[PDB]
Amino acid sequence: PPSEFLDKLMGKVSGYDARIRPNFKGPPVNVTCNIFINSFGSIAETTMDYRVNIFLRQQWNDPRLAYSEYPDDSLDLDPSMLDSIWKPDLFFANEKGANFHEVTTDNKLLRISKNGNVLYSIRITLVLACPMDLKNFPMDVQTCIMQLESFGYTMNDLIFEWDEKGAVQVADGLTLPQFILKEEKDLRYCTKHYNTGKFTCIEARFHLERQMGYYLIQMYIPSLLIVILSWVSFWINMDAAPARVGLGITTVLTMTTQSSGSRASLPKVSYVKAIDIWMAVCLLFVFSALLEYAAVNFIARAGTKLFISRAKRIDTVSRVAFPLVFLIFNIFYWITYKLV
Amino acid sequence: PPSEFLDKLMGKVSGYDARIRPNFKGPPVNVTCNIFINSFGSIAETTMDYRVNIFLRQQWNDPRLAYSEYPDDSLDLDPSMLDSIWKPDLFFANEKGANFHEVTTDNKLLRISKNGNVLYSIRITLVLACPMDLKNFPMDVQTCIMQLESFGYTMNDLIFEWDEKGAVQVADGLTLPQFILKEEKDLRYCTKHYNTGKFTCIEARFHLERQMGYYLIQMYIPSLLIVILSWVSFWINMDAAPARVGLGITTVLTMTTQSSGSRASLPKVSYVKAIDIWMAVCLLFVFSALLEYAAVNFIARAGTKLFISRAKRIDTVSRVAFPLVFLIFNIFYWITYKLV
Amino acid sequence: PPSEFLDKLMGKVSGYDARIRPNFKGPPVNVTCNIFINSFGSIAETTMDYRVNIFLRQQWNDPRLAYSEYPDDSLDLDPSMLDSIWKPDLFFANEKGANFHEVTTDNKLLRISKNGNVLYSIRITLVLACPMDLKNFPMDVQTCIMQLESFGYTMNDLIFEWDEKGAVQVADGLTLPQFILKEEKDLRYCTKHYNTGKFTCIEARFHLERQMGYYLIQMYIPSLLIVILSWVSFWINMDAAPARVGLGITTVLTMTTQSSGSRASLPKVSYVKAIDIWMAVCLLFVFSALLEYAAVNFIARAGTKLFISRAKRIDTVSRVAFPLVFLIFNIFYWITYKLV
Amino acid sequence: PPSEFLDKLMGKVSGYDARIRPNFKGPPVNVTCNIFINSFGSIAETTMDYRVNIFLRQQWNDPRLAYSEYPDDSLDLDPSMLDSIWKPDLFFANEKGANFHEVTTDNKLLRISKNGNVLYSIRITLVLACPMDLKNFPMDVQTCIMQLESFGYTMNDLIFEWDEKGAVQVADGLTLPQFILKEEKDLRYCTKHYNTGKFTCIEARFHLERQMGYYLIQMYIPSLLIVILSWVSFWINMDAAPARVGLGITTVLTMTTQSSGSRASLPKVSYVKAIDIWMAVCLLFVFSALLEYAAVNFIARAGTKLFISRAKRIDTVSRVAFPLVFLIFNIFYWITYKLV
Amino acid sequence: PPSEFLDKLMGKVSGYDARIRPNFKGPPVNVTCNIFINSFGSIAETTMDYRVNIFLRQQWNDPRLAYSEYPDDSLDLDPSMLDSIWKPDLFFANEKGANFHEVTTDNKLLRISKNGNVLYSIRITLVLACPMDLKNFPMDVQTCIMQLESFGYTMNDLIFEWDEKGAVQVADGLTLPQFILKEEKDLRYCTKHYNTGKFTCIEARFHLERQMGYYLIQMYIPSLLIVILSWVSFWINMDAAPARVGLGITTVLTMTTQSSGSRASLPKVSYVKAIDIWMAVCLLFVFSALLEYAAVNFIARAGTKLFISRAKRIDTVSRVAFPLVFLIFNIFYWITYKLV
Ligand SMILES: *[C@@H]1O[C@H](CO)[C@@H](O[C@@H]2O[C@H](CO)[C@@H](O)[C@H](O)[C@H]2NC(C)=O)[C@H](O)[C@H]1NC(C)=O
């Protein structure tokens, strides 16, 4: 008596057609759809995508499924019979591969109300493409989106829109190894315009922000300490070559070991990012110290009072000058990549 | 005569409906379910998940499957006919992908008792999501959970609960490369509250604890020895520059090679973890030794008895002072990350 | 009334045969096909392939599907019934694995016009093979192609050709971590000639160009600075051994650390590429400096005015000579790998 | 006439039931099963498993398949009809995922003899779990097993046992990158005892032994040479600081580069293994040399004949003493990890 | 009229049996099969296998498919009906996993001639196992094979043999990152001998040869230059300790950085290969230089004319002697691993 009523309502007896939309040749059916995120993030810059495991619930009205000769309000449909009912041809416009779940029971749910409203909730795993710009690495902000588009019905037939109360929700307690999923989501429309017509799609923009604290005390702070070690070489008496050449070349070797050793941890983009500018300029100052003494030793190597006054003068200017240049670069750097 | 009785009991003749729950419009069916773990652990911080291969056994009562005209107690059902019987819509609320096993025979088992009790044991492989907080790395304790939730039946229809005697069991002899699976499991309820209603779920919490002994004698001990090597530089006569500058800068280069060389082994989280604080402070002391001599050489470089007494005094304070500071940090560190 | 007309037109009543081509034993059917690229690039030199997610639309004429007793022009066909219609046996001649998409609905679309024209749009994910020549790395240009070939029909039966207006389109906003997808695509024919006959195929050539800016300020610039550091060793007075031997051997160790440290980032090809020539020659000059002083110290070590004039002369030639040789190599290098 | 006899023998006419075991309510059916290994080894300590591609042949007796009205002895069954015959519910108790092979034909084989004997040979690919203990790395011996267990039939119904002549065979010419598959296999029983009853399983134990010769001349020999380089520092006159401090600290830096450079090659276990003890003790001796001179320079730095006799005495003891300590550790090490 | 003749010839009307071989109880059917290679090579020493994407065409004679009442010669069969015809049970004896292709149409082709000849061409992707011996790395030659074996028919029923004109072909333009696919293929028989009987198989041997040019100018040449840098230490006056100890220990540190830095690029085999012998002996000579001076300084440290003549004599022998030993090893090495 429960399940032999859906065969009466969608079988060969009644004239329900599974591949004809509700309100056919009439108003476009409204689909109120909302997303719950269970798991989030296998965020990779190698393939420029991420993964998300969602419950997708989508609700519409099918007037040829209304009924009154059955006692309760809601009447659910078995997941093996979902080819017997109309469903929207929703797909995800930026997916790179996705699947259902079928463990211990097929994880699908459809529920027809007494009104004729249909609630359809599924649980799917998604590999969604979001392009990334790592020009501001590590202090970069990513925006990975999630588009929901009709595949074959235009907006004169099918209209997608978000739920009013809460569209996208995220299960609390999730943790990303790189990013922080911002709590404010950005719901937008993305309505497609092709020669076939206007196709509906609605997008959810997720804001990601990279944590920087590892790259501070593993890349930035040790390089800044090595630059200070090259600044030590200016408070040393001249013509003492092996205690000032060896210091200045050892800071070069330690900066080179710092930059090359930190190469396998940073991503494999092949363009200039904001940590490579720090390593490059912090190499140019450490190199600039030994190049400075390479000038000073040749100036004072000839031998003249002007030569010691000229050598002393160069050191006097240099001792003060290079922390000022590193301070101007140090202000312009963090304003440029951090402030904006 | 054995298998032609289940067709008599669940066929077109008898009125058994496969998608109507037992005790329909009555009490919620109890599901006594328990888990045996065969394999455990492909634990990854990159995707924040693990893998587990389980036998899931779940037992319930179906009163419209009781019988008396068959000689033995237990009557098993073929795995090809499992669509002919009601099964709970159990799913795992934190899975990221999961599958059955079908090699040489589909690894499913259903057994209907003479009482009407149904035993249903399957063998499935799971990729379950557990978020991790590596702030206390390596001396961190993880808690990876395992939730068992009804998908479409509320608690007025279906109730999950663990077995009384032993719910979760783990096959002895398993070994993880990183963690130690604790023998005490934490069985809890997790009962979900949605606008549809209260959905049953039961969770098993597994406690994991990371082994640290590699990071002692490969990261902690060599860094502590390099800090002692920077402490050697204080028991050296002053104005002997290349035997004390070169020592102090070589300890910097060896600490930098130690920290950058140990970078590819540690995980790829982008925030401050407890081994990065050890490498950072053990870099600040080794740097602080050469910065200390960079003060001492300029104090004693001018030339005055006060200058040698002032230089000697600084060395006298420093020789004693830096093992005290490393001892205070060394107590606060291991209490802070190890004791709590 | 909509969907019971396609059963009238392609069912057992009408004599439509699904595996007989249109215009059978007549003219070859024209297939106007065009490609829209959603996602592009998991470009790997390890397996010599890439990935692309496309909409493939292909249009042909089937004269035994024309109709007039139905009100509208276009009449769409359900994706479950696509075995009931003829489709071209198009495959991709350089694929290494590929699949469809079926999430929330099978992502296929077929539309029969009143004229008898059939539009067939699908959405498939592709792993396409393109062989790469990394001899000019990093300043190399790749050309990865995309072939569309008939599988069993010769050109006397089936002819593929691109759409006139726009054949290949790429969704704007895509970003590759290594390359830049050039905006000018190269549409060609590739017509196959076998003993069975001439098989149609049409190819789209995509031009990729590698970004170099990382390898400038991480590989090229630090090596050039180390070569300048070996040039510093010539403006030093002779017979001062430990300040000139230790400098020259420390530049060797820093160049060796630069070359070996940059090894895990560059690809795993086992042949000579254009960055290995830079690292090799920038090792031969840094080695050539200490080998030069290894000559100079033995010339001036014996003791004669000719010996100091001969030593001074060698330094005089060397001080000027090695930046000229590095300038000739530096012109020939960037013309040879960058200009052509 | 060949294939229309199996439809006579297992069809709707004859009373063969596919899901009722032979000799039902009688003796347990014997399954003589044997394994041929084609490929072996994707041995990973990350997931604690390996892969093996086998032919599994299993033979049993089915008395209701005996026949006499057909000319030849053996009568084979088509792989599409294997649901029409009883098969054992064998599974592998330590698999983590496994599949069949179906390329160009489904790779299954069943052959019914005139006696009623059934031979069933399949070809399957296996990911089998074996836990590993890398405490003795590299000179460790692993034992990876392979269990064959009935899934739903107890030992009162089904009994597995190996073939007498040769149970497990391995195709000659296989090569592992890490291990050596020992030629002596260890056939055992593993009979399971559950509350349902005794379930049959038979296991094959494979003995693996790791090759060590890479870790000799890449980890052990260079570290031993660096320890000898620290032993060089004792045959040097005292108060010659920069030629003995710089040697002793350069051996520390070279040992640190050796240990940190060899870190990415060794596995990612997080506990103390036998190569980490070698690197740790070979770091403690190289550190102990400079700590020894850090004592000697302070003893002889004050100035007294007793001080030079005390300094000379310390060197005299140390010159002899540290190769004896490294010899005692060098005997205890290789006996402890290599002999047992 | 085209496709309703194959139903007349292989349907329920005619007595064609799909699982009975042609010429049953007669001569063994000949299968003339040939292979075209589209893509080749995901060659991995970790799993000891490679990948290849082939067209497999196989031709045989089926005398109960000959016809004369149809106008043309060739009559093709639909890929959905391939279970209606006999096909050989060919499989690949060294595959580790393999699949078909089904994109836009199932990529299979069968064509029945008027003679009764059947042509069957498919397109499959293969992971084929070839064991590798990296003892001669990098100058090693691999031989990866490809076996085609009958699964259930002996040689009294089915015989495989290659095509006469061209059996294996490779699509031009392919590029491997490591190897060079040799143009001369080695076609062989491999006929299997089991207790069931003789099973046919035919194999194609592919010869691979590794390119070495990367390992020359990245591993061999820099190590040889460091050995020359240790040869520089012999043309230096004795009793000049810090300019000859520091040189000789810096060559040790640079050789250690060269060997440990080149470790992550070379494969993960755990046995002695031919580049590890080069790095080991090039470490023993660089170590042997400082050990030589560690003898010389103790000989000349005591003080005697014999001591300076003995010291000078040792240097005199050593200056000449070590390039001779490196020349003997350098001849024996390249003859031993390169010539044979
Ligand atoms: C889906 O939503 C749209 C938007 O409200 C509905 O279209 C409106 O229908 C009312 C009828 O009272 C008109 O007054 C509006 O002008 C329509 N808005 C449009 C066309 O943008 C549409 O009816 C809804 N679909 C269904 C099946 O009810």
Ligand SMILES: *[C@@H]1O[C@H](CO)[C@@H](O[C@@H]2O[C@H](CO)[C@@H](O)[C@H](O)[C@H]2NC(C)=O)[C@H](O)[C@H]1NC(C)=O
């Ligand atoms: C599942 O377990 C619950 C909990 O015991 C059962 O509900 C109880 O039924 C008894 C009837 O004697 C009542 O007295 C209790 O108040 C009920 N507890 C509740 C509602 O929390 C329920 O009957 C069981 N299901 C079945 C099918 O027996």
Ligand SMILES: *[C@@H]1O[C@H](CO)[C@@H](O[C@@H]2O[C@H](CO)[C@@H](O)[C@H](O)[C@H]2NC(C)=O)[C@H](O)[C@H]1NC(C)=O
């Ligand atoms: C597919 O395109 C070809 C190329 O136009 C068509 O073949 C031509 O048919 C016209 C008939 O008016 C001839 O004059 C040309 O010589 C043909 N060109 C050839 C054979 O290269 C073909 O008819 C088209 N297919 C269909 C079904 O219309």
Ligand SMILES: *[C@@H]1O[C@H](CO)[C@@H](O[C@@H]2O[C@H](CO)[C@@H](O)[C@H](O)[C@H]2NC(C)=O)[C@H](O)[C@H]1NC(C)=O
């Ligand atoms: C499977 O093997 C067992 C072991 O031989 C058989 O059981 C034996 O049957 C003989 C009958 O002559 C008894 O004497 C033994 O005591 C039995 N051994 C036991 C029960 O351990 C069994 O019959 C075999 N199965 C079949 C179908 O023949």
Ligand SMILES: *[C@@H]1O[C@H](CO)[C@@H](O[C@@H]2O[C@H](CO)[C@@H](O)[C@H](O)[C@H]2NC(C)=O)[C@H](O)[C@H]1NC(C)=O
């Ligand atoms: C497959 O090839 C074999 C080898 O030629 C054929 O066997 C031969 O048949 C001729 C008949 O004229 C004999 O003279 C040879 O001695 C046979 N050679 C053998 C048995 O090795 C066989 O007939 C072929 N199969 C078919 C179906 O024609």
Ligand SMILES: [Cl-]
């Ligand atoms: Cl150094």
Ligand SMILES: [Cl-]
């Ligand atoms: Cl280094």
Ligand SMILES: [Cl-]
């Ligand atoms: Cl590294």
